[PDB]
Amino acid sequence: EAEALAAARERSSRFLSGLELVKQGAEARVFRGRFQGRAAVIKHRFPKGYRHPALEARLGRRRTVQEARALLRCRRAGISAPVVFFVDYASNCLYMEEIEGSVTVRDYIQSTMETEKTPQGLSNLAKTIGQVLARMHDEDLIHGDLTTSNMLLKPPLEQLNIVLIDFGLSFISALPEDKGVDLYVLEKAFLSTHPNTETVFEAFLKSYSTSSKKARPVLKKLDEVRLRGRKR
Amino acid sequence: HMQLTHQLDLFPECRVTLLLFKDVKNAGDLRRKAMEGTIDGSLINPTVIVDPFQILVAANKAVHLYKLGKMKTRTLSTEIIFNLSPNNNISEALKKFGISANDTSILIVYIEEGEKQINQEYLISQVEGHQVSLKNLPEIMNITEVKKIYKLSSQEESIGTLLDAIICRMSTKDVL
Numbered sequence: 315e316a317e318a319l320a321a322a323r324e325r326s327s328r329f330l331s332g333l334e335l336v337k338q339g340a341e342a343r344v345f346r347g348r349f350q351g352r353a354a355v356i357k358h359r360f361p362k363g364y365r366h367p368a369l370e371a372r373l374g375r376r377r378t379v380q381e382a383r384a385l386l387r388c389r390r391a392g393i394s395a396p397v398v399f400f401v402d403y404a405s406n407c408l409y410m411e412e413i414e415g416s417v418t419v420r421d422y423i424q425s426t427m428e429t430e431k432t433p434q435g436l437s438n439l440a441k442t443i444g445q446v447l448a449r450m451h452d453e454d455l456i457h458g459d460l461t462t463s464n465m466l467l468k469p470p471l472e473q474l475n476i477v478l479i480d481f482g483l484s485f486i487s488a489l490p491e492d493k494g495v496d497l498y499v500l501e502k503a504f505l506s507t508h509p510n511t512e513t514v515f516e517a518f519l520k521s522y523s524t525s526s527k528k529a530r531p532v533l534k535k536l537d538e539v540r541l542r543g544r545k546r
Numbered sequence: 547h548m549q550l551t552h553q554l555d556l557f558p559e560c561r562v563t564l565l566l567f568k569d570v571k572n573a574g575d576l577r578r579k580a581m582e583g584t585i586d587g588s589l590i591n592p593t594v595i596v597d598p599f600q601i602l603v604a605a606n607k608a609v610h611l612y613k614l615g616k617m618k619t620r621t622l623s624t625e626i627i628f629n630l631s632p633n634n635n636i637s638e639a640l641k642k643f644g645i646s647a648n649d650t651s652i653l654i655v656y657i658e659e660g661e662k663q664i665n666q667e668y669l670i671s672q673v674e675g676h677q678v679s680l681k682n683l684p685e686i687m688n689i690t691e692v693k694k695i696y697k698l699s700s701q702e703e704s705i706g707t708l709l710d711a712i713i714c715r716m717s718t719k720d721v722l
């Protein structure tokens with residue numbers, strides 16, 4: 315077992331040898347390739363020689379396990395998100411469908427505000443984001459790390475087809491305090507990366523609250539989380 | 547009457563070969579031989595296969611757990627069938643996704659690793675049936691029962707194919 319496992323992580327590394335690297339983070343590298351004839355993308359949560367391989371072991375596993383159930387939960391709910399093809403729990407790799415020809419919402423918003431020159435043009439996109447996160451939260455699924463770079467825009471761009479990605483920190487909870495804190499981190503994501511887009515966050519919020527049937531208590535806890543800075 | 551063979555992308559030492567038969571008369575004898583081990587490969591209900599991708603994903607996860615020694619079933623050829631079920635009921639999985647005594651079309655899947663090959667002309671010789679090419683697989687597959695045995699949704703077909711909804715419960719059932 316101890317020898318066979320080294321082999322299974324050794325095929326992994328070989329397989330990713332010849333693949334284009336598309337996303338890199340503190341926890342995960344994302345390679346682009348093909349998997350049994352389908353356009354796929356492989357998300358490796360690599361170990362770092364910096365800490366105890368006992369703690370690092372479970373950290374890769376939890377993120378991968380949690381992303382795997384989160385993408386299943388969204389497929390069975392009409393929440394659009396990548397399909398998962400294979401999950402290697404020996405190497406913490408996650409083989410999923412590539413969202414071909416898509417662009418992040420972050421570059422759809424610093425591309426629309428350099429030509430339109432006003433945020434007045436973004437209220438349809440905000441409307442649809444409110445609809446997407448409302449039906450997500452309505453199945454008590456907390457994303458965990460909502461930013462405008464974990465939402466993709468599938469072609470055709472005109473119809474605003476939002477695909478959510480990166481669910482490693484996601485989790486199930488019906489607590490409005492948890493949905494509230496989930497929207498707060500998306501709010502701070504707008505603030506840091508997209509200047510002067512504050513009017514865009516209620517075309518979102520007003521959309522969310524007319525699209526999710528339990529949103530009233532979540533927006534009371536959002537305004538309580540905005541006042542405190544955290545959940546407590 | 548043509549095979550369809552594909553190479554496993556993460557285990558390029560292996561290949562997966564698919565053979566499909568119509569008008570089978572000895573499905574009952576064929577099943578006993580799988581439990582008895584005489585016949586090589588996995589005998590799968592083609593009624594519920596929507597694309598070879600369904601077979602390869604199952605094949606891939608089976609070799610992976612085979613090579614780690616942590617398979618949930620016994621044979622590799624039985625782990626392939628099990629990995630097609632959306633549940634973890636091993637016995638329910640192999641009745642509903644295997645072949646049964648009064649079936650008329652069966653699908654044979656087998657993996658060969660490296661130089662070691664299977665006597666494919668002895669394998670066909672055991673089936674009292676008309677081997678057809680896998681291009682004929684859509685006209686055997688029944689969506690009314692793909693939806694029943696996979697419990698596919700209203701919402702699930704609204705955001706993608708039914709192959710995607712299937713693949714995406716095959717590949718996560720080991721984590722509930």
Ligand SMILES: C[C@@]1(N2C(=O)c3ccc(C(=O)O)cc3C2=O)CCC(=O)NC1=O
Nearest residue numbers: 336337346355412413414415416479480
């Ligand atoms: C670059 C792009 N891509 C994904 O599809 C994807 C899927 C999941 C994740 C994730 O972090 O979970 C990240 C990504 C990602 O960046 C989008 C554009 C494109 O055309 N092809 C891609 O591979």
